[PDB]
Amino acid sequence: GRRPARCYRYIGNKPYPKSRFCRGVPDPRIIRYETGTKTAHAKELPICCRLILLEHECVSSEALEAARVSSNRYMMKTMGKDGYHIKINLHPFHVLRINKMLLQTGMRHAFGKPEGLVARANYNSQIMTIRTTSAGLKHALEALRRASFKFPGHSRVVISNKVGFTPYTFEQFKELQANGQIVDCGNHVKRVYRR
Amino acid sequence: SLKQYLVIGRPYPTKEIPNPPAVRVQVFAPDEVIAKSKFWTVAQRIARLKKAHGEVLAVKHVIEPEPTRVKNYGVWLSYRSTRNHHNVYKEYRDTTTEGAATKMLAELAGTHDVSADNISIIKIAEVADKDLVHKNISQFTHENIKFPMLKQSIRAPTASARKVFAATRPTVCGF
Amino acid sequence: DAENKATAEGAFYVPAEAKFAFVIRTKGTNKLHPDVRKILHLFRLNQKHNAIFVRLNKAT
Amino acid sequence: GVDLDHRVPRKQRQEPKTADAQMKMLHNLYAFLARRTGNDFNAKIAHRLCISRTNRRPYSL
Amino acid sequence: AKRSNTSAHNRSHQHHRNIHKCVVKKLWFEKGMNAKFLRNARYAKAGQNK
Amino acid sequence: QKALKEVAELRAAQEAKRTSPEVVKAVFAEAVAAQPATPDNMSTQIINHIPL
Amino acid sequence: GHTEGLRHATRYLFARKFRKHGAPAPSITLRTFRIGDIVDIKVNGALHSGMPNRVYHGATGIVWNVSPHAVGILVKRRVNNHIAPKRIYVRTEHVFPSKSKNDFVARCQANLKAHEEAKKAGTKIALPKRLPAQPRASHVVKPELIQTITDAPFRENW
RNA sequence: UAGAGGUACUUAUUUCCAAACUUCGAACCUCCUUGUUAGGCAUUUACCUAACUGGAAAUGCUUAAAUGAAUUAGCGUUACAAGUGGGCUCUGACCGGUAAGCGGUCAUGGCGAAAUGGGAUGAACCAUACGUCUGAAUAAGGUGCCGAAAUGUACUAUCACUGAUACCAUAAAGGGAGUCCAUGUAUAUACUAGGGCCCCGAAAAUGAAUGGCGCAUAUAGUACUACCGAUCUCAG
Numbered sequence: 004g005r006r007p008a009r010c011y012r013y014i015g016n017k018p019y020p021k022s023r024f025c026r027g028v029p030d031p032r033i034i035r036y037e038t039g040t041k042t043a044h045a046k047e048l049p050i051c052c053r054l055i056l057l058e059h060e061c062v063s064s065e066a067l068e069a070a071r072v073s074s075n076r077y078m079m080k081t082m083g084k085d086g087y088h089i090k091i092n093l094h095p096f097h098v099l100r101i102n103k104m105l106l107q108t109g110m111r112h113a114f115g116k117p118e119g120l121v122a123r124a125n126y127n128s129q130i131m132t133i134r135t136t137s138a139g140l141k142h143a144l145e146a147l148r149r150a151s152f153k154f155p156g157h158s159r160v161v162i163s164n165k166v167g168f169t170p171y172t173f174e175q176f177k178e179l180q181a182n183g184q185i186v187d188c189g190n191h192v193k194r195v196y197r198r
Numbered sequence: 199s200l201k202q203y204l205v206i207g208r209p210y211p212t213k214e215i216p217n218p219p220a221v222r223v224q225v226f227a228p229d230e231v232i233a234k235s236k237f238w239t240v241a242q243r244i245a246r247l248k249k250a251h252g253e254v255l256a257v258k259h260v261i262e263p264e265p266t267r268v269k270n271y272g273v274w275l276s277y278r279s280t281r282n283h284h285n286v287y288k289e290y291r292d293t294t295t296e297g298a299a300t301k302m303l304a305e306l307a308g309t310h311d312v313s314a315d316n317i318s319i320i321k322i323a324e325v326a327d328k329d330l331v332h333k334n335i336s337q338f339t340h341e342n343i344k345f346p347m348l349k350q351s352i353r354a355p356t357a358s359a360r361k362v363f364a365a366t367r368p369t370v371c372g373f
Numbered sequence: 374d375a376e377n378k379a380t381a382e383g384a385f386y387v388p389a390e391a392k393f394a395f396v397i398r399t400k401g402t403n404k405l406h407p408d409v410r411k412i413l414h415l416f417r418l419n420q421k422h423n424a425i426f427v428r429l430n431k432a433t
Numbered sequence: 434g435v436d437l438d439h440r441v442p443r444k445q446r447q448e449p450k451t452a453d454a455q456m457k458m459l460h461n462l463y464a465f466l467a468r469r470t471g472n473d474f475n476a477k478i479a480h481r482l483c484i485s486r487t488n489r490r491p492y493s494l
Numbered sequence: 495a496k497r498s499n500t501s502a503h504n505r506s507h508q509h510h511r512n513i514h515k516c517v518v519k520k521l522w523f524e525k526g527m528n529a530k531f532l533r534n535a536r537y538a539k540a541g542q543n544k
Numbered sequence: 545q546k547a548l549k550e551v552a553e554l555r556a557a558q559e560a561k562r563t564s565p566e567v568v569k570a571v572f573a574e575a576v577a578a579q580p581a582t583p584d585n586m587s588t589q590i591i592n593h594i595p596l
Numbered sequence: 597g598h599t600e601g602l603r604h605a606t607r608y609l610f611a612r613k614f615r616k617h618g619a620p621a622p623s624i625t626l627r628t629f630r631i632g633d634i635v636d637i638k639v640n641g642a643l644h645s646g647m648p649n650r651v652y653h654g655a656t657g658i659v660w661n662v663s664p665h666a667v668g669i670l671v672k673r674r675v676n677n678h679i680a681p682k683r684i685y686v687r688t689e690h691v692f693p694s695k696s697k698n699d700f701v702a703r704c705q706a707n708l709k710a711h712e713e714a715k716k717a718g719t720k721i722a723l724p725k726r727l728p729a730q731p732r733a734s735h736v737v738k739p740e741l742i743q744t745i746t747d748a749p750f751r752e753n754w
Numbered sequence: 755u756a757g758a759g760g761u762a763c764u765u766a767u768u769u770c771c772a773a774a775c776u777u778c779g780a781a782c783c784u785c786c787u788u789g790u791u792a793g794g795c796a797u798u799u800a801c802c803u804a805a806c807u808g809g810a811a812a813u814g815c816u817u818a819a820a821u822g823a824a825u826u827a828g829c830g831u832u833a834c835a836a837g838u839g840g841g842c843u844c845u846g847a848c849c850g851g852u853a854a855g856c857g858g859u860c861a862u863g864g865c866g867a868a869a870u871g872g873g874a875u876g877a878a879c880c881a882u883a884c885g886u887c888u889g890a891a892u893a894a895g896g897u898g899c900c901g902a903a904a905u906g907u908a909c910u911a912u913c914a915c916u917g918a919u920a921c922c923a924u925a926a927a928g929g930g931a932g933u934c935c936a937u938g939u940a941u942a943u944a945c946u947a948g949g950g951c952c953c954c955g956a957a958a959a960u961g962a963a964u965g966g967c968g969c970a971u972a973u974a975g976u977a978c979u980a981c982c983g984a985u986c987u988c989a990g
Binding site (some may be wrong): 006007009010011015016017018019020021022023024035036037041042043090091092093094096097100101102110113114115122123132152155156157168187188189190191193 | 755756757758759766767768769770771772773774848849850851852853856857927928
Binding site for chain 3 (some may be wrong): 823824826827862863864868880881882883892893986987988
């Protein structure tokens with residue numbers, strides 16, 4: 004099954020990805036990182052709403068899929084697959100290991116086979132987002148409150164100043180749009196550098 | 199105790215730019231030697247000026263025009279606690295700017311439990327009675343203030359004349 | 374007077390820096406790094422509460 | 434508490450380890466001179482009389 | 495059975511009790527060097543003293 | 545001991561200039577001039593939601 | 597699995613910088629050496645005949661032999677207790693004229709320039725020497741830009 | 755990871771990564787130099803050069819001018835021989851492990867072989883490393899009583915079968931119109947950005963330990979003096 008995740012919280016080795024050398028690895032629990040109206044716009048869904056982690060530790064793949072399903076099913080219930088856009092901004096690349104044990108040969112040839120994927124967070128790493136309209140900003144905060152109980156440690160839910168997932172404030176966005184320096188890609192904002 | 203200081207410093211002349219901009223910082227420290235080090239902390243942190251290339255021109259000690267009378271003091275500060283930074287406007291009633299700043303380091307260490315390492319003041323200034331908006335300090339600017347001294351002290355009037363016996367019992371009533 | 378001249382003008386008289394110092398050894402011998410007691414042996418400050426005058430330049 | 438190196442690396446022979454009268458006697462003669470006249474010649478003759486028999490090698494004719 | 499493999503804790507201490515600078519006797523090393531050079535360097539010295 | 549009486553006087557004569565009513569109000573005016581403008585709002589994040 | 601090979605743990609030593617691959621310029625082969633000359637060994641990763649060891653990369657020595665393509669270099673490795681001498685042979689394409697002495701030799705000739713020219717007028721000499729960076733004379737400073745630095749109120753900005 | 759633009763690929767982007775990826779690249783390190791340096795003169799060579807009144811090298815002569823960073827310090831060399839070849843560990847860096855008073859390395863320090871004082875008690879932590887004595891003033895650490903020394907002065911919090919001084923002798927995620935301080939708005943009042951202290955979350959076996967007694971302004975923070983206190987320091 005699994006260990007309790009208090010086993011694999013803090014980081015006591017170098018990072019250990021899926022590669023030539025690791026070999027016998029099971030694939031992660033996550034497939035979809037991103038749900039809702041993916042094909043939308045910066046201008047259509049300006050209001051954004053992040054979940055920031057306040058610890059330096061490992062986050063499991065099992066936590067991140069629990070957080071997606073609890074996020075979707077609240078936002079499906081309230082407003083009904085139109086406005087919202089959910090995204091997950093951790094990708095689990097670190098592979099865990101086990102000594103197994105299950106007569107026995109314990110602590111001899113201690114290196115162990117990979118058990119599961121994990122994501123290494125950093126103090127103030129955003130581990131989730133919800134982009135939405137001003138009508139359902141209320142619903143976005145109540146979603147990320149529920150998603151925070153999935154994750155280890157403690158974790159602040161924050162309304163961002165900046166538009167979309169773009170790195171531009173609402174004050175800056177009108178000045179660049181007006182200037183005509185910025186442009187619109189199918190999704191997100193692509194700047195014009197005049198070169 | 200803390201003394202208000204004004205420190206002005208500058209970077210050395212390069213051949214590219216002789217006579218650069220100097221910069222001043224208001225600092226609060228027990229003596230002239232500590233006041234330099236508080237200046238180099240704030241100058242490095244903000245205006246990008248290091249100890250290893252800069253003069254320091256004038257440590258001016260700010261004495262009060264009058265310490266005879268009482269003034270109100272607004273103190274805008276940030277203080278840092280684990281996981282967050284908070285901005286607070288707090289105010290005080292005192293003879294001088296230093297004694298207000300010495301008060302709030304005790305009050306933050308008391309009430310919020312943060313040391314002077316974490317605290318970073320924005321603005322101290324004296325403030326009039328009209329613009330003053332906090333209720334517990336506004337009461338002392340009114341006329342006809344009575345409060346009793348409930349709970350008197352038992353101390354020695356001089357440290358020679360203390361004693362650990364008494365025939366009669368002391369009365370600690372306000373009266 | 375060189376200080377009081379500059380204040381009346383506008384400027385600042387910055388003073389001359391200290392040409393030498395006086396260096397009390399405060400802490401004793403033991404639990405100490407070998408580079409950092411090679412350096413004390415060069416000032417001849419071997420015992421606790423010892424002192425000499427030391428000239429100030431970017432070497433010292 | 435003082436930081437010094439207390440050990441002696443170098444001993445030196447001060448007076449002779451012979452139990453003769455005569456070698457001990459004329460050591461004190463040239464020791465007396467080597468001090469008092471203050472000269473490089475007599476200082477060497479004083480010290481040569483200190484040193485063991487192996488180092489006093491037999492200088493052939 | 496299983497005791498320690500190595501340590502370097504107090505290698506530094508022992509080395510510094512005494513890192514004596516071993517000085518070279520002379521810069522030429524006539525076992526090495528070109529023979530054709532040293533061959534001629536003999537006939538410089540041999541011709542001079544006569 | 546004659547010289548260190550004279551130097552004691554001259555260093556004390558500077559403290560007459562430092563604690564004069566004329567000089568102290570200039571230094572306090574410099575300290576009042578140095579302080580920044582009053583902040584309208586505290587709080588970590590202002591939060592602006594202008595349409596577009 | 598610790599190994600004691602010749603070219604071991606030299607992934608990045610004998611790498612060839614970046615846009616400096618290929619053979620060297622033929623100006624390098626035209627350069628000359630002498631006995632007594634101070635030279636620094638740093639390696640061409642390309643030219644494989646007559647390398648030094650990995651250890652004597654970035655290592656100053658003195659030339660003692662010179663030979664048709666290669667230079668015998670005396671270099672002081674630190675052994676265990678003591679500083680041993682090591683007689684290297686190594687090719688000229690791993691060897692450059694070191695600028696250790698060029699501070700010293702500049703001063704000696706600059707001193708003789710001063711010591712002679714003092715006597716030419718004569719007159720009488722002041723003696724120059726090197727000196728660490730020294731604490732400053734007093735002097736007076738007027739600026740006319742004075743900013744007033746203060747700490748701002750903290751805001752998150754995400 | 756996920757869209758847009760072209761004819762599954764592809765041109766620009768984007769979310770987010772690598773001990774066995776690198777187009778950039780620190781800190782900390784490391785190695786060489788710092789007194790003799792410029793010449794000029796003419797012998798030697800079977801070597802080098804097309805050639806010698808050249809080169810290369812060593813032998814002497816000599817023309818000039820000086821001892822040309824800091825701080826410290828006498829330096830060099832040989833012989834004979836003991837014990838040892840189980841180590842352990844604080845603070846940081848690290849490999850394996852769920853973790854360990856676990857196993858294996860690294861740097862300085864400590865113990866082993868180091869007393870004395872302090873942490874009630876302790877090999878390892880802090881002050882300090884010691885002849886026998888007599889004083890003074892201190893360090894670490896302390897000053898209700900046990901216990902030598904202020905229940906010190908000035909300023910803020912706290913009611914709980916509760917709290918009480920590094921290493922250290924355990925407590926988390928998550929809650930609270932308890933109280934104090936507090937951010938932004940709306941109309942004395944409603945809505946909350948939060949912060950401390952206190953409470954809940956919080957259950958083991960002999961009767962039980964902030965060291966004890968006890969305290970509630972002897973609890974939690976902050977500032978400034980006085981004072982006790984080591985085999986250190988100083989004086990004899």
